[PDB]
Amino acid sequence: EDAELLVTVRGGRLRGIRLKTPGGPVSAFLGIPFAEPPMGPRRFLPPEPKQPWSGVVDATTFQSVCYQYVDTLYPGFEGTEMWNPNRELSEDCLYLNVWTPYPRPTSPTPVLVWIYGGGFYSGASSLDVYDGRFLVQAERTVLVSMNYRVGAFGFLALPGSREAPGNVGLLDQRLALQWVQENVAAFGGDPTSVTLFGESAGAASVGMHLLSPPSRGLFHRAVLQSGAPNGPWATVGMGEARRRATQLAHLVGCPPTGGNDTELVACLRTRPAQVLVNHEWHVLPQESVFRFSFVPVVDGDFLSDTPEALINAGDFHGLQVLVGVVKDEGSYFLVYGAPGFSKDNESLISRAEFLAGVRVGVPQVSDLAAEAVVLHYTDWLHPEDPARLREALSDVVGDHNVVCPVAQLAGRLAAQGARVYAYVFEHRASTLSWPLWMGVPHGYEIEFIFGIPLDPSRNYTAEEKIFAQRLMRYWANFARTGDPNEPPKAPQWPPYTAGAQQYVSLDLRPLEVRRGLRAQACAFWNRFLPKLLSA
Amino acid sequence: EDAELLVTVRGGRLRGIRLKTPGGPVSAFLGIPFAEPPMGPRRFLPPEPKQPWSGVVDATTFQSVCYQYVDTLYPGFEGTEMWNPNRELSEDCLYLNVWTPYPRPTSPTPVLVWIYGGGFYSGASSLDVYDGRFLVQAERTVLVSMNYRVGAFGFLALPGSREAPGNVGLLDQRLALQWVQENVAAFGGDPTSVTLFGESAGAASVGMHLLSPPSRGLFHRAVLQSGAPNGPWATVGMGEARRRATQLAHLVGCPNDTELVACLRTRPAQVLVNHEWHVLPQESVFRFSFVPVVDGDFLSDTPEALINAGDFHGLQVLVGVVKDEGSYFLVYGAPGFSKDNESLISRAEFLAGVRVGVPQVSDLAAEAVVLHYTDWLHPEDPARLREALSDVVGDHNVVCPVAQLAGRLAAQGARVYAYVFEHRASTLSWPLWMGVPHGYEIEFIFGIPLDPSRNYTAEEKIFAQRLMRYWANFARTGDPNEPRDPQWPPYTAGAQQYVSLDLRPLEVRRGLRAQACAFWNRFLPKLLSA
Ligand SMILES: *[C@@H]1O[C@H](CO[C@@H]2O[C@@H](C)[C@@H](O)[C@@H](O)[C@@H]2O)[C@@H](O[C@@H]2O[C@H](CO)[C@@H](O)[C@H](O)[C@H]2NC(C)=O)[C@H](O)[C@H]1NC(C)=O
Ligand SMILES: *[C@@H]1O[C@H](CO[C@@H]2O[C@@H](C)[C@@H](O)[C@@H](O)[C@@H]2O)[C@@H](O[C@@H]2O[C@H](CO)[C@@H](O)[C@H](O)[C@H]2NC(C)=O)[C@H](O)[C@H]1NC(C)=O
Ligand SMILES: COc1ccc2c3c1O[C@H]1C[C@@H](O)C=C[C@@]31CCN(C)C2
Ligand SMILES: COc1ccc2c3c1O[C@H]1C[C@@H](O)C=C[C@@]31CCN(C)C2
Ligand SMILES: *[C@@H]1O[C@H](CO)[C@@H](O)[C@H](O)[C@H]1NC(C)=O
């Protein structure tokens, strides 16, 4: 028996595994139960803490993926399969993972906690791209990641009811953070230096923990990659959540529409998990891209008000945040619905297809609102150029859903006391399989932040390995000190501020400082458009 | 006795005067009456044709200026005085002027007809800057300009009423155009080749003649300089016209339309002038009290509607703008502006300036303006705020109405030529920050730089000569171009080509502020309809 691979946490004893990494051994504790399995009667309910156990639990492999829709748009394509589940689907999925240096740190070590994305309907901490071994080895931090319920299982809400209160997926995340506080020290981790990070839906989740006081005491810093809690896709109002829940129930035979919430939920609880998943997409109000059926609900509880309001009206002194976007936030989403789009051709759309795309990309707004979008994204010296139109629709979708929500967050946090750092990730991986026109799409900085290029079995260039090490260093510097900059002659990454609005480009070249996160575009989305929607 | 200066027109006999230019003499007939004096009972009424006279009318000097407000913002300043009346004010002001080559052309000569601007409340055909002598000498056209009633006298309207029907100043212009049809041959002019040109409110006037069928047969080509009939300032609705006429009556102590007009008719002209400004519904720049009214008669619909629904095959138009349409108007009411400093305003002033420059719109509409015209990387930079507010006022009032006219006309059969005039005159007395302001291409079109007693460079003289040639070429053929050697292409809705006019050779460019005009012409109307 190896002492390094044995750990006692509040619930009982654990046995882990020793991982080989290019730079030396790391201890991994994979598949640690942190909640009672949300099975049967516990479906849709807040997570209950894992009851203590006798004997030794083997934390030696990733546990099951929470139930979720499995993408089949491009079967076998690396760009899709890399995000699909790599363990069996089960409702019994509430497990977290701890990676620690080998041997275990002697003094308390800063902790990175990863929260995966997947549009709140998919994802898993077990994916190859979230492998924490390289980060832990390169930077000597402790890394934790958790599974949390997605789709209806995590975010179906009948607001008011005790039986399906909503936001249980976020509560899963909270429970894991509480677990980190109570237990991370046993792995050599410092519960007083915990940095959350997540991408997309995971980034939006991070932001929601920022805006929810019971979560806010469980970490100290935040990293939001390509996502913000205030994005128009990340939350839903109480009535729209109820409408969607009720529509799903109706689609699967419950009750034999609406009625007693207790009874409706009881009928949903008898439906096989896969049955719910198969009907998930059918509850959305209109045809769209970047819209997902079951997402966090603004119900006054987890979120006391909309994330926009909470951001605008919050005191963020003492908080450090790192935020950023990839170069082409919108391109990935266009090949999943927008007319005229494919990863397999140039997607050189016509004007009519562009206008149609605007309604898909900006769903459920007035015609006037749509006209305003068309006005600001049309080049009136070239209104019909297909390549320009393609780029413009990509910007529309990307600005609306990601860049502008991130910019508003960054700007407001800065103005209200937070030290903020902002980046744009501009490197397109040598191994990227999406067509060239998509540029650097949503989600493709992650592999670099996690140091995946160091994986010997993969075919990244040597420069990309150097780049990955640079990025991990920034992230870990931020985790440790609240500042990504090196504790010399190397170019400095300046704070982002509401006035100067400075951010850095992340690519193979050194840091270049720039101004404004799509400032002209984001003034439209963040300042004007909301006034138009009120009138 | 010089027989070249004796002319007989339908109404009787005229005596002109020989004028000198650096290129030789020209014949001028100035102060020819074309209407009965619109005085007493005739105030506010449509013009009546001038009754025949016996003997010889002295046509050797300019006649009286129509009653109008006199600008005293910068007393004695050249940039203001060159526009002010240079003859006594009188309601007896309906005279026109003819300039012709000397000796008088013995064969049909193409005719240019000038309609002055002045916001529809001022202006005169006698101003130095409208002197026809250089154009006529250099380009051998006949040139006609007329006075027309302005302010309340030309445009006060109680719609429906016989006593003040509105648009009479426009009918003064039409009557002069009719006079040209009937009499211009007696001077060597060819009534079958009449080109209208005008600037600002004059340009708006030309456009209105284009869109009004009884005028459309009195001319053949049109030139619209820094103005358009679809400008948000150039017309007013029946309801607002009535409100303004009513407010004027009240302000001057008058009370039924008949009684109201009758009481107005008893008031000295100067008294109407004194209260003219005070009938506007809000503090503004680029808005004027008495302008043409859309009442179904002269204009059967709004100019925008008429423009969109017209067949313009057979028409050639020359349209254009100066480099800095908005700047001049900012020193007449925009907070923080003066000709005497840098006018480096604050964001607060910029924001206050927007409500002034875009009066009578919703807060939402104003916010949209602020969104479009703010550089969000530099939201508070005074220099940029000054340029942007100039852009707001100029795009909204001039550039974009002109762009729309050009686009629709071109797309509906017209052959259109477009220009931007980008030369700042060496003699210009407005500060450098104003750039090339509204009105300051005119002196070049009329070839004023050829006047020896003025201080233009030799380059500017050559330039004026180029410009006179473009304009006169257009009047002769519907195409400004000289024989090939760089060519001035037609403006089209798609390619949107126009040329820059300055000391350098023609340079072709695309888009009359296309991004900004998309906002004013495409988006903003939709917003206002909701
Ligand atoms: C680019 O591709 C889209 C998507 O169509 C699919 O992908 C292509 C690579 C090709 O294999 C198509 O046959 C596939 O259907 C094309 O848009 C489709 O057009 C067809 C009719 O031509 C229509 O039935 C589909 O509904 C369309 N799909 C969408 C989402 O609009 C598009 O025409 C291609 N562009 C080209 C070829 O220039
Ligand atoms: C530039 O001048 C404007 C206009 O003010 C006038 O012109 C000046 C040259 C000077 O003679 C002023 O005294 C004149 O009144 C200034 O705007 C005015 O500011 C004053 C206070 O100083 C205020 O009471 C007025 O309301 C303002 N007038 C307007 C048009 O709003 C402005 O301050 C000057 N800007 C600078 C210094 O760049
Ligand atoms: C809102 O962002 C997303 C919405 C849906 C999905 C993903 C998103 O971001 C991508 C990267 C990462 O976040 C996980 C999955 C993504 C790629 C895989 N697709 C199939 C699911
Ligand atoms: C709408 O344009 C204008 C409104 C009012 C005035 C002028 C305008 O354009 C200028 C040039 C010319 O047309 C005549 C007068 C102008 C300059 C003199 N001021 C005093 C009056
Ligand atoms: C709904 O039905 C259940 C099943 O018996 C019952 O116990 C419960 O009280 C009902 N709830 C409401 C609010 O009617």
Explain this structure to me?
Chain B: Huprine W binds at residues 119, 200, 430, 438. Chain B: Disulfide bonds join 66-93, 254-263, 400-517. Chain B: Glycans are attached at residues 256, 341, 455. Chain B: It catalyses: acetylcholine + H2O = choline + acetate + H(+). Two copies of one chain form a homodimer. Chain A is α/β, with parallel strands linked by helices and 535 residues long. Chain A has a single domain, classed as Alpha/Beta hydrolase fold, catalytic domain (Rossmann fold). Chain A is built from 17 helices and 16 strands. An eleven-stranded mixed beta sheet of chain A has the order 3-4-6-8-7-9-10-13-14-15-16, sandwiched between helices. Chain A has a three-stranded mixed beta sheet with strand order 1-2-5, with no helix packed on it. In chain A, helix 12 (351-361) packs parallel to helix 14 (386-415), helix 13 (367-377) runs antiparallel to helix 17 (519-534) and helix 14 crosses helix 17 (519-534). Chain A is globular, with a radius of gyration of 22 Å. Chain A binds chain B through residues 368, 371-372, 375, 378-381, 501, 515-516, 519-520, 522-524, 527-528, 531-532, 535, and chain B through 362, 364, 367-368, 371, 374-377, 496, 510-511, 514-515, 517-519, 522-523, 526-527, 530. Bound molecules: a molecule of 3 linked components (NAG-NAG-FUC) (2 copies), (-)-galanthamine (2 copies) and 2-acetamido-2-deoxy-beta-D-glucopyranose (NAG). Residues 335-338, 340-342, 344 of chain B line the site of a molecule of 3 linked components (NAG-NAG-FUC). The site of 2-acetamido-2-deoxy-beta-D-glucopyranose (NAG) has 3 residues of chain A, from helix 8.
